Amino acid sequence: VNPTVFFDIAVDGEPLGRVSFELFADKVPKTAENFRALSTGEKGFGYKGSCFHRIIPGFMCQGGDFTHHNGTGGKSIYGEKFEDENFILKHTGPGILSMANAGPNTNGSQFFICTAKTEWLDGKHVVFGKVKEGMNIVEAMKRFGSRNGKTSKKITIADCGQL
């Protein structure tokens, strides 16, 4: 029942590799659907060509600001920012996919991929998926970040879609 989405990740235009994600539509269907649809481009906008603008190596890789490319932007499929669906799922280790947000009940399109256990984010950020294939790629991506998040190269979603 849970959909799978892929990102083909590139580093300054050059192919790094593929990350796939299981999306937990059986627990967080609205949040899963948002990410899924932004990944296929079916609404006429979404993640293709966007970047991971904030990478903090021992914490997480953040992306999905496909409108401003710097964390100030984002847009859901719902025409408005949407509610924290639930906080059932926990931030249990590397590969957890979770909503970035800008406060309670402000989910747009930004998300992050955990590169460590971040248990203290529990109840603040909605977990809605986890990396299925390509953890090695996420582990390579974390090399391009810094304390504070600025990336040393442009890390982009060169292609994306639903498997």
């Binding site: 903090i56 600001d65 964390g71 100030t72 984002g74 800008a102 930004q110 984010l121 950020h125």
Partner: protein, 146 residues
């Protein structure tokens, strides 16, 4: 206030109940004559937002005036929020959330977060920013009463 101990170490120091009594007094002797403002500045050097609230919370009666002051604080806290939109995403290790207006005014922030913002390099001087808002409210009261 933030202060130093005898071994050269940074410590928060609770507000001297002697500075507090001087202040409360001032506001009750002078009512709200223009001289309360310099007094407040004098008495609140180095104050955290927690210390500032302790000051204000002690003012006995003058309910109408204190309410004018609270309205001013609230308007300034809203303006601060309007001008300082939050960046999306989880707070990184060894960083703090950027203060909201209510953080600056002490209501949703701890002493220890206050001190973190104040003593950070570069700092966010939450005590000085809150003090400015309070002095604008004091100005409003003084314009009303004298």
């Amino acid at each position: 206030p933030i202060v130093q101990n005898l071994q050269g170490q940074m410590v928060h120091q609770a507000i001297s109940p002697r500075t507090l009594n001087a202040w409360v007094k001032v506001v009750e002797e002078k009512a709200f004559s223009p001289e309360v403002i310099p007094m407040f500045s004098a008495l609140s050097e180095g104050a955290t937002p927690q210390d500032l609230n302790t000051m204000l919370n002690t003012v006995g009666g003058h309910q109408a005036a204190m309410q004018m002051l609270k309205e001013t604080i609230n308007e300034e806290a809203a303006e601060w929020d309007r001008l300082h939109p939050v960046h999306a995403g989880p707070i990184a290790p060894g960083q703090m959330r950027e203060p909201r207006g209510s953080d600056i005014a002490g209501t949703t922030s701890t002493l220890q977060e206050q001190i973190g913002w104040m003593t950070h390099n570069p700092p966010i001087p939450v005590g000085e920013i809150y003090k400015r808002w309070i002095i604008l409210g004091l100005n409003k009261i003084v314009r009303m009463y004298s």
